[PDB]
Task: inverse folding
């Protein structure tokens, strides 16, 4: 008794919010992938932070490494609501990751070593290593209980995924005790589970270390001159060889409004998945429940007026089907379908928006037809523009993925001669 | 030089947020009129507070007297964002107005006397007496500059209003210097201005006193056994007899996005004006600009998901014309017109909502037709209900004003047998 | 597993901060006993609030009933640091206890009934009834675990106390299962424990109810016309007759830095105990540990400069032995012993302060000798005053208890002709 | 009228908190000079921030460049108390100053260019360039009024200083209109004022630019390949050649409790001045008034218990003369003189501390004699250590300045074999 309440209390979260999101390819070019707008008013890292609140871990480490100003500002404004006198705080740890090191060189692990003295000053018994550019719902206290029950030194959150995409994350092979037998990091030919050939038991980048080991284990890897200083390439394979690595099935701890559904864990890294995962919310029955009161997700909530709908220049009405319209939006006529409008979006008359993601402060000119697109923050689409109808034009002007999703950025439009400053 | 910056610094605001709003007649029965929801996510007193922020008066006194729990909670959550170490705070002063005293007996003024020692502890040179159940935009620093320039002891904000409603507020007659010649409080036959017969120069319940006089002036009225201890009936007529009362034309200080319009000051006290003033925002060109960045109005902003629009049970779309939909709302089909939806309103399919004000957390059942109505907070309208089409039915069930506006409350619906707890 | 973490989450604290502290007899005459300054920078209710934080109960109800302005202001400034979007808040519930009712008439319980609808809106499974004018350290989660393990409907925190003072609190007789056999409220002849004749097993005013019962149980007592609507006189005796009342030995849950000591629970209600409990902190080995990092006690922490020590008018030094000097204090010479100085105390030269409690903003004139006294907040002791040396003089001027403790208030000194406004 | 209130509103502060403080030589080796502890509980940058609050400039830019984690954390905890919805915020701008650039290469100015787009997003009419590693009290609104009255494009705060140290700051020669005639940056032979030979009219690193010029002026210097991108070397000399530079005598705007004193502006950069400026506060009549209520200086105020004084191991008392003891300190006996104790300092028995600055969390062992020293944060001085009595020993072990001041750091003591981790 009195373990699940005294386990978060002794533990500290370390959100590795340094992802470059290179597969968004322009969207995160300007801001860290943890700061990517998602689903109304939220930011991706909020998820990884909210799970730490609702799981009782009120001591978090936000390790900002690349292009991190908006993440710093966002944390400062929204999550600067803790009294540090009662051991509950979001320590924003600038990583200052070595410039000598290239993109993902002096990797994930080298950023948690540079700030090791400050982590030691926390005197935690346990530590929660997290990837803070993912979307999921999880109670980390259930994972800490499952970590202490097994008497392990590292606990990896493992989930079965399709074997056609399992090369993107580390793949493990476990025994009856969920103890790791074999870890392999980004394999070209992922091994399947024994019971399921079409699936692979992949890691989720959610580790739980006992602190005194983690420290003892980082320095050995820090002195190493051959390692990539990466949690998947170097540390977890070593712990697997030692035999002190255990697995945690994510279905045990995922926070689901409805128990019947398949666990929800979206690795947003590619544009087409960002678009899909933003449009899941606009559907008739979303897979991710934002209206869950048992498990609320918090963000920086600014004072916006209600979403205003008005008549077009001709005086007619506007139609909306399966759409999200956040605060500050203004709409005039303009049939909307399957789309998601972030804050302060102005859509003038005669517009047809279908399956679009409009990031904050967009200005859509009159008579615009937008389809299967992602409009970056603070764009100004000119009058008469047409996107998504002719594929070759959209590839020629904007970034069009192989699937058909289009990404419209200020830069692209500036280059087209449509002046943006407004 | 350096007067307008050093004038708010020496002054403290006193918001008289004890209004009963008796002319709403059920709406404020449960909460103080300053806590009445207005226009999306705001509360009326926020206006009187925001004007104090944007006018530099960061020391406010919120004198809560009647049925004041939601106002206390609202202040505690939203406006508890000040560091008192730098002389900037919202002192929530429980008035504890004498029970012996009846409704508006031991009036406006007796509530600012009971807490006089604490007001003296502020050591202010000036004090701003405000009515905190009104809607307006005003820069009080311009009023303090105009107060010091004239060398007065009390400065009353005066505005011309129609003489057919001027009996509701105190009426003054001023000279060329804006110095008060004759004050009269709630006259049955309001005297007209000399230049305009159809108008009367009425007070707005916005006074500015030099503190050392105000104190000296309250005690004399406090020792008095004949007075009503009311700022309009007792104090300001006395100052008018002394000749130390001056007037401030509200057009000089009103904060207007567009200078061409007539000043905006709504005395919400009656239901029909609450409805109109809430529906002005949904119109094509509102008279009150909420999107003004120079003069933002702040409220308690809670984290709500975006306004979700979905398909009805039949799969068809939903139409919105000249409407406001705040955060957390959910709509399925349901043609909406000229209405305003507060937070967390759920409107099921086949509904026709026209010129309605739906306060937070309403649940409208399927196939509801609502017209020219005001639905009180946390109602649950049953399936098939029809309001606003047949006047006699709406008078028989709910409160129907003489104009045609309908007010739907939990109590009324509970009495009809429609069980509300959900 | 996962009970102690999911038990506070479903529970809400109700701090009954309406105590009049009549046995302080002037100290709480001006402010609610929960707002009584204690031990440096803290307020008594902070203890009852901090225990709710460190025990995970982040939903608190502060039921303010009498003379409650400083408590409201204190909560608003200090404990208004919660985001209510994640179910964690201090709901300041004005009780508005019936005036018809006299001092402790329509008692403890009638104040938790008037606000019952709002408590129901919390949808808690459990509720923690607390006395918020006491000093103690306790982990309420251990008490909730012990409450669920026994399968009870009310859990009372019981502690053995001396039988010479056991008439002050309710006395219970329990079985081997800690199930209540016999409850009796403020008996003139308290029954002793069977094993110890010199002690009585008394209640601590810390109850834990399962919510759905509590509601069901308040209304029955609310409809009652014969009850005192008191938790000790009416409700807990009834639950004892039903047989659904269980006891919780406070030694199991008390948070002690050193396990060897006897539990620390001070019922401050009398002046002499307020003085002793404030001087325990100044001793060489305090019984209550404020430097405990595992269990921090939070208060409204204002920005004060360090405690300044300077030379007297003659240039000599100042001596301090077993003393506490909080922020903002200023001392010149002035031998100090066994005393406790609250914020912004100025002690001029040639003063001898021995075993004194100086509340905030005191001004001690030159050549003052103070001994075994309690100086109320914002006093101004004149030059040459002598307290504590001649008992009859101190009884004649100030309030001198039977033990010898002296209480100096502004009123008393105003009456002596020593003008205080400074 | 209504200029001094509408001038801060249109202006934004830019605190250049990237100083390396190389002349402290170990003290700032670990933390940015703006984060250097000063005078009880404050940090140097707090001054530059507090002046912006009390001068109405509630929009600040904290440009963190070097070794900036504690400054980020300090801002996040203390100064994250603003609602950004009402245009009032501390935007923490990571500078990410070019590594290619050496210490003070791509200087002061290049750090305000890299973040130019975000500064433009503020749409300020004026901008306040500040050095955030200095100590002073100033009302910037008086400076903005004096800036608009003269019709200038840059306003430099100028003060006469002694000509024996005037080579450390830029030296100007002005006309009767306070218009700059000749600027020269760090001259080896500073020119004296015409009326005073012993003084030079030096700059204070406090500039006020009209924004649209500043932008226009940075890019020209940014395109330049020959400049040092320094505000003193490059920009202000260019503006002086244009003739659009004006001077602001700092005595007009300094905030002084007593008008008779000489303005207080301490350039802390050297250790001996840090020690003196920290010991000015402990004196009998400090030159800098921290008890000023008109102009409060705010810091991150954590909940600390009062400064505890107790008896030594032998039971004797402790003497304090002209000393500051902040919260959390603990003292046993231990004669103290002319010193300043930061938070959580523990001084065991038999210690003689004279004219010392003990930074937070120091642990002084028994029988220590400390004189004319500066003990760095979180040291642990062993038993019997003697500092300041024999100069050669202190030079051999610790850093001893030419004047006699000693600086004790963890590193130094670690190297001596006194293990520090506690
Ligand atoms: O080319 P620009 O003008 O920087 O525009 C790129 C856009 O990226 C942004 O930096 C994105 O902002 P955030 O990612 O910080 O929310 C916008 O501020 C900006 O308009
Ligand atoms: O009859 P009930 O159940 O009190 O309902 C009346 C309604 O008035 C309210 O008190 C209004 O709330 P606020 O005015 O505090 O926003 C609701 O909480 C409540 O549902
Ligand atoms: O007789 P007075 O002037 O009210 O003085 C009584 C004292 O009691 C106090 O109200 C006590 O204050 P708190 O109890 O609110 O801390 C002081 O403000 C006041 O000086
Ligand atoms: O050699 P170490 O262990 O880093 O110690 C150096 C000291 O400098 C510090 O970083 C100074 O802290 P701050 O400057 O952040 O207040 C201490 O945390 C630390 O103890």
Result:
């Amino acid at each position: 008794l009195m373990l699940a309440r005294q386990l978060p209390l002794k533990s500290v979260a370390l959100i590795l919010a340094g992802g470059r999101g290179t597969r968004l390819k322009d969207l995160t070019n300007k801001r860290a992938k943890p700061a990517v707008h998602f689903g109304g008013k939220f930011r991706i890292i909020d998820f990884a932070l909210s799970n730490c609140i609702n799981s009782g871990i009120r001591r978090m480490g936000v390790i900002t490494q690349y292009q991190s100003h908006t993440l710093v500002q966002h944390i400062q404004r929204g999550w600067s609501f803790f009294n540090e006198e009662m051991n509950e705080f979001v320590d924003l740890l600038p990583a200052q990751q070595r410039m000598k090191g290239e993109n993902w060189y002096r990797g994930t692990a080298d950023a948690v070593t540079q700030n090791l003295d400050i982590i030691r000053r926390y005197k935690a018994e346990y530590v929660v290593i997290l990837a803070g550019d993912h979307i999921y719902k999880q109670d980390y206290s259930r994972m800490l209980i499952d970590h202490v029950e097994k008497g392990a030194r590292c606990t990896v959150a493992c989930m079965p995924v399709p074997i056609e995409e399992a090369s993107a994350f580390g793949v493990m092979a476990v025994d009856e005790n969920d103890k790791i037998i074999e870890f392999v990091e980004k394999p070209a030919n992922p091994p399947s589970m024994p019971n399921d050939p079409s699936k692979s038991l992949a890691s989720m980048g959610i580790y739980v270390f006992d602190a005194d080991y983690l420290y003892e284990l980082l320095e050995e890897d820090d002195r190493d001159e051959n390692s990539s200083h990466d949690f998947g390439k170097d540390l977890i394979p070593k712990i697997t060889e030692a035999g002190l690595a255990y697995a945690h099935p994510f279905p045990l701890s995922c926070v689901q409004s409805d128990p019947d559904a398949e666990p929800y864990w979206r690795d947003v890294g590619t544009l087409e998945a960002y678009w899909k995962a933003n449009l899941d919310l606009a559907s008739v029955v979303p897979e991710l429940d934002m209206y869950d009161r048992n498990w609320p997700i918090r963000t920086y909530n600014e004072s916006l007026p209600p979403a205003k709908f008005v008549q077009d220049r001709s005086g007619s009405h506007g139609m909306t089907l399966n759409s999200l319209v956040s605060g500050g939006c203004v709409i005039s006529g303009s049939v909307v379908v399957q789309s998601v409008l972030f804050s302060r979006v102005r859509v003038n008359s005669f517009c047809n928006i279908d399956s679009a993601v409009l990031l904050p402060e967009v200005w859509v000119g009159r008579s615009c037809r937008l389809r299967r697109c992602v409009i970056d923050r603070a764009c100004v689409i000119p009058e008469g523009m047409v996107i998504g109808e002719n594929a070759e034009e959209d590839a020629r002007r904007f970034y069009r993925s192989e699937e058909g999703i289009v990404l419209v950025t200020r830069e692209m439009l500036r280059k087209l001669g449509h002046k943006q400053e407004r």
